[PDB]
Design a protein around this ligand. Structure first.
Ligand SMILES: C[C@](O)(C(=O)O)[C@H](CC(=O)O)C(=O)O
Ligand SMILES: C[C@](O)(C(=O)O)[C@H](CC(=O)O)C(=O)O
Ligand SMILES: C[C@](O)(C(=O)O)[C@H](CC(=O)O)C(=O)O
Ligand SMILES: C[C@](O)(C(=O)O)[C@H](CC(=O)O)C(=O)O
Ligand SMILES: [Cl-]
Ligand SMILES: [Cl-]
Ligand SMILES: [Cl-]
Ligand SMILES: [Cl-]
Ligand SMILES: [Cl-]
Ligand SMILES: [Cl-]
Ligand SMILES: [Cl-]
Ligand SMILES: [Cl-]
Ligand SMILES: [Cl-]
Ligand SMILES: [Cl-]
Ligand SMILES: [Cl-]
Ligand SMILES: [Cl-]
Ligand SMILES: [Cl-]
Ligand SMILES: [Cl-]
Ligand SMILES: [Cl-]
Ligand SMILES: [Cl-]
Ligand SMILES: [Mg+2]
Ligand SMILES: [Mg+2]
Ligand SMILES: [Mg+2]
Ligand SMILES: [Mg+2]
Lengths: 286, 286, 286, 286
């Protein structure tokens, strides 16, 4: 409306307005513009996406700055509310506080922080270990301490795969008590566990619709009918982009020319429309 | 021991001709490397457009430098970087060259448009006079290392005709440019006379949706061309793929129909060389 | 609820006159805040010089933006930022304003020099015509929020005389500048006629080693000035102190003679508010 | 000589040439230019300095990017070899590897990494705890794995204050066996412990000459005569700069003008000489 809303308020309103809110991963500002064009009401900056786009595996190598810089580029280009993955907060209480404040300064609408172990030994192997409830509570309190009211903290639990449904609900509920605004859980293997989950935690729940993992793909409607308020598509666009890029590279290498690839390329014209190119080049000219 | 610039010069000498493919980010550069390209490119229009900006000279040294650094962190494959008109006067050009060298960049191209430049394939470009471009080149050559490659790009063809273009190119070589970028030549039969006149290696720009027909690398080489550039080819396909995934999710409430068009986790793991990470930990911490 | 720009406008209205002190970094801004200044300044010459560059328009939006962000992260004290001539054309100026707003900056000043600008106190400045500066201002006003302060700076005095300067300033106000920066006026008696003619608040630049005698804030206010700027004062003393410590260590093999000239750990801890950190941990994790 | 030496080689050579090498802290590029002018042969980027200059306490809040960005600005301005504080490496093996590679890419000559605990619990209080020898060995091996031969890794031990001389020597020796190039220890309370220390570890030893701690100030000559190859002055310049800045701020606030401060300010002329201003403004002019 005519209030000029804060990013967090826009996010909360998008969640309330949609049934459910679909949030799509965008690796850069241009992809966010594409999503906006299609009509999505919220967008997402994946941590794994930030790492992988740098040519790094998703092993917690990236820091606040890697993510912050990708987030800033996106929010500069669109007012569509952005949810940002900040992993485990990048360090202790003061680093978490810095992350929240910097994300808010970057006009980000929401972040999710998770309950994985962060600060393992130097030569410590990759794995799927959870911190205790109390430790995650501390992380949340560090975040809640400095956030504005409108800004959305989503607490993400990875407990489901490891601990089962009951333990997950207990954590999620404790996380809400600590001040989390919403809850991020993996796609439950059984759609009919959602009503119990959503009713227990009270706050809006996000379901993560990842491909090529251990989790099934339900429709947004199905998920909403079972109590879910947000559905996330974290890497979907990016996996298709990579296949397309690879195919173009192979085409050029094999054939000495990109002719066969032409039908698979967005046109200059469509690119110009997404950028509003003509309302620059033409619009203002000597 | 072998500098980026040296690797570039050697790639140019070894290949007939050297295909240089655009990569917008480090992951795309890894894809190109996997396919077996010998040099990669950071497009200025790509830098701008990926930020959601038109290619109108809004971006500065920092926008481009940051994208270049992310790519060279991930690969030793020699990178050619678009630095437009050098981002300002002599001192800015000098800063650009030194920063590009510090970022392990192999080559740059700088062009002879007036400051507020456009795509070389667009109508209504203004050129600086030969003397002014000479000054730009001199500023660059004054601070570059010997191995580092300065490519002088001329946009003169559309505006001044083939003869004037060749004269500029030749003057640019005399001023110390290492190679020539012959932008938006409309006919394969422009190349032999161009390439014979300038002597130094010449790049032909095989961009789509422009003023050039798409000739093969062999055809271009047979006409005296040493480098063929594919500046945005991968990027255009990526955008269409992203858009298609976004439409799928919006229309169908789920990304199932998109799955066949996505790179697999396995292929992603291979391109990131994920297993070398586990390997390294076993190597060092055992 | 109260925007940076609003805090700035209010500081200007409340003080007689508002003293604005240069701070090169966040720690200097904290020192100024401690002393009780109501507004702070990020000098363009300071941005350049601190990088080891001359103040010749080599720096870009990113150099300045990064220094501005570091300061505003540390303090809510309203910050005025030097954006030179806007770093390029209309679209660059628009980007600068939006980025400055995103960085929580309160005010900017933009001047009427030609692109490759110098210190306003140096001989041999070239000015753009009034019309061109008007265009610059319009580009800025078009995208700014209402609260955000655009200060139009004129360097015309040395080149064109007092009368021409006032005419420009007045045209700049008509174009939408909020306040006026009257650079390098040589005599206190230039101010009353200047300030009365332009109406909007006027800043006088009390820089050292320039073309201006150093008048008191009271004297300047009595002549109709609303803001007095001390752009590099702290920075010049810091450099002499650093140099003196370096000479001490080099000459004497030890820094003993320098100890009396060093801030104590205690004072440093107070300015950082170090104890609030321990306090916060006790508050939250008990 | 006429070889064009790598930064690390320049550092090694500076250490070998001097008796001992004095390395002075510089918070920014301009301070590094001042040190170079005075005649120092190596410079230092303090971690505490990076944090404090951001207005942050030295509590491990800063990351690789905060330090990297300050390091890049310095090395852009001078070829004087820079030693950079990278704390405990900013995370596990892969983060350490990234830190080394990025520091090398930034033309840094040397880093020091320490044996403090890093990855404490979220709401975990500030303190002076050491990791076990084995853990630091792992950190060193992570670093040595990716560094170039010439690049200098200095292993820093904080064991002295906590564990005594004997335990410190044992750690230092183990650190050298793991591949550290040099050793950083606090100022030993007894100058005559240095010969034993230096003879046991073999590699060059740095003594840290901090003010206002628990460590005494010996002269460079005294330290060198006892076996020490490097003496560090980490914050000295910066503490004097802060006192000078504060004094200028108080002057302007108290007196309404900076006249009393003038004798304590570096002149425009001296600033111009350090920057080589005249060989820009004059040197190249239309
Ligand atoms: C959402 C996620 O955490 C991410 O890093 O984007 C991933 C999603 C994915 O790529 O499978 C996750 O850890 O599930
Ligand atoms: C090569 C180019 O300079 C670019 O910035 O990618 C462009 C390509 C394009 O617009 O398709 C150009 O100006 O030719
Ligand atoms: C205020 C100023 O614009 C600056 O960039 O600090 C300078 C100050 C100076 O050079 O002393 C100016 O141009 O007046
Ligand atoms: C060298 C040091 O580690 C630093 O962070 O610069 C400090 C020095 C100091 O400021 O006392 C330290 O921890 O001793
Ligand atoms: Cl991965
Ligand atoms: Cl916007
Ligand atoms: Cl920001
Ligand atoms: Cl609840
Ligand atoms: Cl465009
Ligand atoms: Cl590499
Ligand atoms: Cl040549
Ligand atoms: Cl690896
Ligand atoms: Cl200067
Ligand atoms: Cl604050
Ligand atoms: Cl007005
Ligand atoms: Cl605090
Ligand atoms: Cl501290
Ligand atoms: Cl240099
Ligand atoms: Cl770099
Ligand atoms: Cl030994
Ligand atoms: Mg993630
Ligand atoms: Mg371009
Ligand atoms: Mg200035
Ligand atoms: Mg430190």
């Amino acid at each position: 409306y005519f209030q000029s809303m804060s990013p967090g308020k826009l996010f909360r309103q998008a969640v309330a307005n949609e049934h459910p809110l679909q949030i799509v991963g965008a690796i850069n500002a241009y992809c966010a513009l594409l999503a906006e064009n299609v009509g999505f009401k919220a967008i997402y900056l994946s941590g794994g996406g930030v790492a992988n786009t740098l040519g790094l595996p998703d092993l917690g190598i990236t820091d606040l700055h890697d993510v912050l810089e990708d987030a800033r580029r996106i929010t500069a280009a669109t007012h569509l509310p952005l949810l940002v993955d900040i992993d485990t907060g990048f360090g202790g209480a003061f680093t978490i506080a810095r992350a929240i404040k910097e994300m808010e300064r970057a006009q980000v609408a929401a972040v999710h922080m998770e309950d994985q172990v962060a600060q393992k030994r130097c030569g410590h192997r990759p794995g799927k270990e959870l911190v205790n409830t109390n430790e995650m509570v501390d992380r949340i309190k560090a975040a809640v301490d400095v956030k504005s009211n409108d800004f959305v903290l989503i607490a993400r639990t990875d407990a489901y795969a490891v601990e089962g449904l009951k333990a997950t609900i207990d954590r999620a509920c404790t996380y809400v008590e600590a001040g989390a605004d919403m809850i991020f859980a993996e796609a439950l293997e059984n759609i009919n566990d959602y009503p119990t989950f959503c009713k227990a935690v009270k706050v809006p729940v996000l379901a993560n619709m990842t491909e090529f993992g251990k989790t099934p793909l339900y429709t947004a409607a199905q998920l909403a009918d079972h109590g879910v308020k947000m559905v996330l598509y974290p890497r979907s666009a990016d996996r298709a982009m990579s296949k397309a890029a690879l195919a173009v590279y192979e085409d050029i290498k094999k054939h000495g020319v990109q002719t066969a690839s032409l039908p698979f390329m967005q046109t200059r014209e469509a690119l110009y429309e997404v950028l509003n190119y003509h309302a620059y080049e033409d619009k203002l000219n000597q």
